[model samples]
Target: CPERELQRREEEANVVLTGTVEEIMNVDPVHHTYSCKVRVWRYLKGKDIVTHEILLDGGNKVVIGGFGDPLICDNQVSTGDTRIFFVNPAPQYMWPAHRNELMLNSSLMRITLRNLEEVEHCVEEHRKL
Candidate 1:
């Protein structure tokens, strides 16, 4: 049971960009807004890892951070601890997860950017139907 617990912990652990974190201030190419560079962890969830990244022009486009509101950094992440789980699955929600009670808090959530353009287009077409 103990080994299972440990395994589960790794399974649920948030994805982190296991490299140096830098700071930057620049303009967003697409959004045309001022953007800031923050040293954040990219939560990953998958079966295979090809390589690690900490360079410019990397394929790792999606970035994930904390989920809990006012995220606290104590390094005390366990099944019962109220911590943030930042997951960046290959296919978002790729696998089924069992969120424990500690992860149920509103402060603990998944902050993500979803492509809603398709939804908007579908809605627009449905209006004509």
Candidate 2:
């Protein structure tokens, strides 16, 4: 079940990369959202969509709580935090001023790799589909 879930998430993502958070900017207290500047290390997918640097939205400033509603899968990061990112284009309302901007596909999209080989293997496996 986990493998199928992983594959489904991989297929849903428009872009996937290993990156470090460079800076956290544009914190919106009212919306409980923020943006981050990330430095790309490697791209497993959507290389044509991004390069050395990218901006990401939907970062949560504080944990959002509610009843019977699914919590938002906001991208949460700190400066210099490195992890794999699965993202898609930010919606028009949340789009950054720059062209290289994206939003996390899901909370699972920002996971740390135990080893580089693991992701490389997964990427290679996904390409066969």
Best TM-score among the predictions, by candidate number = 2
> What would the TM-score be for candidate 1 when compared with the true structure?
0.25
- Give a tens-digit lDDT track for model 2, residues 1-129: 122355666777777777777777665554555567666667788766544344334431111111111233434667777767767765566533423456666443445455456656666788885
> How does candidate 2 fare on TM-score?
0.63
| Candidate 1, 21-123: lDDT as tens digits | 2332332343232212233344233213323322223443322222222333221222222222323333333111211111211122323333133323333
RMSD of each: 17.6, 7.2
Candidate that would win on lDDT: 2
TM-score of each model, paired residue for residue: 0.25, 0.63
Q: In lDDT terms, how accurate is model 1? A: 0.28
Worst 10 residues of 1 by lDDT: 98-107
Clashes of 1: 6
Off by over 4 Å in 2: 1-4, 28-31, 51-74, 93-100, 108-115
- Give the lDDT of residue 114 in candidate 1: 35
